[PDB]
């Protein structure tokens, strides 16, 4: 049974960003193309974007081309829509469907996106990609920035393990200049895709000492010493990374 559930909608101002998720169950999600469509008050269901089963092909409506990006994580049976540079006319209920745009959402589906000058000015950060890996292994963390993200000048990563002080480990500006804590240098890489409102932490050569809750952080004015941000304005809720040997 095909079961889809959208999330990540909300209220932003023009020029803001949102990241929609659609979690799939009850079918081989990775075998099928998937689609986002949207319905604005008193209008028909409009096709927005389609992505191939394997993620390697995409298509977009002319009205969103260059602003929205479809993606998927087949290991997590989840479909995403990154909504950058939001406009008032992007306001709609957004729906995920199996296939190419001929599918109809089931009752109960939908996440509301509202783009309004009357929305608040707020930033939200959300990490993902934590897991349990072996010593010497690799992991990639992501951080989605949503809301009024235009003010951000620098982003970075912190970590904290039970019993120890939080540690700032890497930071980066919009031009891509980065610094690192000595503890992670030449093992971890921070990268971004600010066109896509995403920050990454590529983690290689993992050690047990790397086991920690990892958090992303942002600020409106860059203040960093050796990878460690001070004067942090915004921060996420955390993703756990556990490095062990069995």
Author numbering: 1 to 246
Direct quotes from the study:
Results: We describe crystal structures of four unique bispecific VHHs that engage and activate the cytokine receptor pairs IL-18Rα/IL-18Rβ and IL-2Rβ/IL-2Rγ. These bispecific VHH molecules, referred to as surrogate cytokine agonists (SCAs), create unique cytokine signals that can be tuned by linker engineering. All four SCAs crystallized in a dimeric conformation where the two linked VHHs interact to form unique antiparallel VHH–VHH interfaces with their complementary determining regions (CDRs) pointing in opposing directions in all structures. Interestingly, comparison of the four structures by overlaying the N-terminal VHH shows that, while the C-terminal VHHs of each SCA cluster on the same face of the N-terminal VHH, they adopt four different inter-VHH interactions.
Two SCAs of interest, one with higher potency (DR638) and a second with lower potency (DR736), are highlighted in the screen. To further characterize their activity, pSTAT5 signaling was measured as a function of their concentration and compared to wild-type human IL-2, confirming that these two hits offer unique levels of IL-2 agonism. The DR638 IL-2 SCA adopts a conformation that is similar to DR3097 in that the VHHs are positioned adjacent to each other in an antiparallel orientation, but in this case adopting an inverted V-shape conformation, possibly due to the linker comprising 4 residues instead of 10. As a result, VHH–VHH interactions cluster predominantly in the form of many hydrogen bonds at the top of the V-shape, resulting in a lower total BSA of 861 Å2. Similarly to DR3097, the DR638 C-terminal VHH CDRs are close to the VHH interface and involve a CDR residue (G147) in the interface hydrogen–bond network. We inserted 16, 24, 32, and 48 residue-long rigid helix linkers into the IL-2 SCA DR638, thus enforcing distances between the VHHs ranging from 24 to 72 Å. Compared to a 4-residue flexible linker, STAT5 phosphorylation induced by these molecules was progressively reduced as the inter-VHH distance was increased, thus confirming VHH proximity can be engineered to tune SCA activity. Similarly, in our IL-2 system, the use of static helix linkers derived from Myosin VI to enforce spatial separation between VHHs also allows for tunability, where increased separation also led to reduced activity.
